[PDB]
Design a protein around this nucleic acid. Sequence first.
RNA 1: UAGCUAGUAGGUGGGGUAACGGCUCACCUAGGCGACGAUCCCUAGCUGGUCUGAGAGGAUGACCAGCCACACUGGAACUGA
RNA 2: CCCGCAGAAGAAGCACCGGCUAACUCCGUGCCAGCAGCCGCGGUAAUACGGAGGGUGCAAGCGUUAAUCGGAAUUACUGGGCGUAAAGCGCACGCAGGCGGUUUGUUAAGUCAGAUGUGAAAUCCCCGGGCUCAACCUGGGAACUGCAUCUGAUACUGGCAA
Lengths: 157, 205, 129, 82, 80, 123
Amino acid sequence: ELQEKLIAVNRVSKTVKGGRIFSFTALTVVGDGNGRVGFGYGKAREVPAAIQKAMEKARRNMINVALNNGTLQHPVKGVHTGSRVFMQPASEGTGIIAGGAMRAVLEVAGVHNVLAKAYGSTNPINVVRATIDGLENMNSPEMVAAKRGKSVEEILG
Amino acid sequence: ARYLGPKLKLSRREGTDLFLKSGVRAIDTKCKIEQAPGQHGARKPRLSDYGVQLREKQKVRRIYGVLERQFRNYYKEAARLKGNTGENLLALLEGRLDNVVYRMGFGATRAEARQLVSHKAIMVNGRVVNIASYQVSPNDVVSIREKAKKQSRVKAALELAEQREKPTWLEVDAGKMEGTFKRKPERSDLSADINEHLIVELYSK
Amino acid sequence: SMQDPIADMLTRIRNGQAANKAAVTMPSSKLKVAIANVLKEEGFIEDFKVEGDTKPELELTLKYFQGKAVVESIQRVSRPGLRIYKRKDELPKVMAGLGIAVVSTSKGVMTDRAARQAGLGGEIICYVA
Amino acid sequence: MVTIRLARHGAKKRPFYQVVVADSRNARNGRFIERVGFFNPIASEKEEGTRLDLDRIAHWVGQGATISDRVAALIKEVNKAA
Amino acid sequence: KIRTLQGRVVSDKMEKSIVVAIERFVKHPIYGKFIKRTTKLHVHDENNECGIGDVVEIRECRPLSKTKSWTLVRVVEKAV
Amino acid sequence: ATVNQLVRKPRARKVAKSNVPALEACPQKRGVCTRVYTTTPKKPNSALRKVCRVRLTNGFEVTSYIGGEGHNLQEHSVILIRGGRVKDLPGVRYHTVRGALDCSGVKDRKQARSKYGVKRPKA
RNA sequence: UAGCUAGUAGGUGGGGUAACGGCUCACCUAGGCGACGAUCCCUAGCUGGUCUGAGAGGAUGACCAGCCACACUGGAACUGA
RNA sequence: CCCGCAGAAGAAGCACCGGCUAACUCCGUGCCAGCAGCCGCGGUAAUACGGAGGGUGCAAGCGUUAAUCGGAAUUACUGGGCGUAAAGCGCACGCAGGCGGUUUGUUAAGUCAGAUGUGAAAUCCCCGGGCUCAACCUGGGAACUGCAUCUGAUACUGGCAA
């Protein structure tokens, strides 16, 4: 019911007095498929422990995003540390059109539409922080009407 | 243009029954399923995100026996059509003449159905068609030609259809051998286990 | 040297929202009042004062529904170095329709939503959402 | 010299003639003023197979448009009265 | 009604003919900027009724030389 | 940026040149094929690559690589030259199409026989 | 490629063309174009269209069609609407 | 195009399998033979070479080469930057050019609305029809984002006057 998904695994080194000592860094995202997303980075000496420490970090770092019956509300930019993530509302887009580390964070959000495009850097670690940043700042018409207009009807035509 | 090969090995690579070898014996019982697509079939590969798209795209193609060139034209026709692309693409595959006769139950397998339609045994609307990829329109009727009727192939196949799921978009009488195509199939009317979500995504790259 | 008096509104409002200022003031004009009247009836600004006899000071008063800003992003479109005009069928929809686009049409200054039922477009003043 | 003639179109062994108003010095499928209808030699009983804009044809013959042999039979074939 | 175009006189010492530049306010095809373009024209008129550097009225007429297919109509807001 | 400067000087495209400057818009050419010899590769590799200089019919003098194991080229026997560099030998920009006018296919090649010009085995 | 142009820019008169027009001659005026690129060099038939591209754009002009120019090369005229 | 005869008889190959990218072992050679679009393999235990088996992809086609676009938001109008990655002229004045505080009247030049002419046909798209289906042909519509004229709107830019 949480729909876990690992994205990428990278091997890093420390270069100590004895020599190179290696370590593994993972990148996982979780999400119930109804509007909640969350990522955990994680790092350990071996791959299964580096994955598992990313299992727990993502669960406690979940954020809530309101969805328009399975798609996002409006087109939005998602700039975060050289990664210019942009997505269009794509009403009934019939399949996730998204790139690397773009599909995993979106299919756990609970979507099957919207087109995506990533500009600038394509680093997996930054773009998954770019997608959540683009998702969280979005507002739906039921709370746009609260902050301005004081009416749900006239703000959407 | 056809497969012409071991049409149970395609089910072993996909890990599910594709109804390529249904026949009289319901349970297969000779497949060695999920353990030998080849020499190294015991091992489980990593199956990356492009792989789950390619296996999903091939699985629907292995079922209906449609090649890549003809299947890609079906996707472009489903893209230009109004509504959901995956719904139209499954409707286009379910509207094929060789598919619908298997849905009528006149063929035990789709390959048997594809051979039956090619041999001028389908007599649709009083107009004989031997094209497997003939897109049947709603409220049409299909029948069996007298020169190919009751020749121990179809009566062995129509008695195999009562253990099937009884499609609700068509009606079969099996006494006059006249099958009608009432409406376009819906998403809930078909198998409902196939995921058309991965199908559209693969053709976008 | 103070080329675009409309973008002077837009940089003061946007900085007024980030600085959590309750009210802002600027030298008023007829066009400055018209856009402020559009923002008044749409829900971005509750009221504005135009006090002044020879040097009117358009005293806008910013609102905050929560600790965040009501005016999320507001941008200048019809810059004096690049004028932008749009037809009735080419009026943009900022933020999937739930964000207005102040347009200077032949009947006056109003939103893109109001201009479409008017059946005529004009100069796209700004994108406020 | 303005003439009303047929333009050979369609696939091989499936001809489709479009009755057109063109100049006699032009080609068969070449430059023309305007088209005035079509004609289907290999037709069916579906709904059609011969259609002409007779009011525009009579407009051209007042300006000296010569009617060629086949369409003159087609003008007789369309049967203005019935 | 005849289509008349405005324009300002550039050169006058041309012996019963005159050079007038027409300014057109056109949009750029790509960048969308409004660049003021200039359209010079040889305009026919009587001997000298308008000086150098003034706005005149131009209409299209029969060609009268290797250039100058446009003639003058009237002179409004004359030179100073 | 600064659109006013753009109307005075538009965006100049990145002009690009091909890696095979032998009669652009042409798949293959033939040459008189003089001086078949060998060349040692660059330092990360070590071999005795069978390379060949080609005097093309257009007047160009270029060197080409002979793919496959063994050839029958000596100072003559006009061959077919196609594009494609080596990334092992500096200067070699082309490849010899085995199975052509005067260069036979590589012997005992059962796999990838469409390349190297090898026909189907008889039985 | 920063200067180009001397029937060249315009005017008067004559001749010429189915027709205006330095189209062509006599005379006079010293004009005319050009930094919103004149002249010079290289290359290229143009367009509806084609391919690609979400779009904007980019490349392209085979086939069908419209226009142009050419008919061994250069030049010239006759017949003929 | 339809009917009759005979029988599965007359009809399947091509590329790839280290990652990018779908697919693995074994044998032989040992920085040799050779592969390779890039990263890079081969140093006597090669999923990268050659062969065998197995598999993957496409299919009367399959690979290679050549050319264009895309990815390339590495020409950024949409849609990039200039402290250290490439990028502030050493500084200043200043012509053309570009932009320009605020109020009123006027103009409608730009802008917008409507109408007319035109934007050939063929081509794209949509709704249908006809070839056994499809390719293909065809009817109608839309489109041809453009240009010109006329009638208005006067909010914004421009001209004029104060």
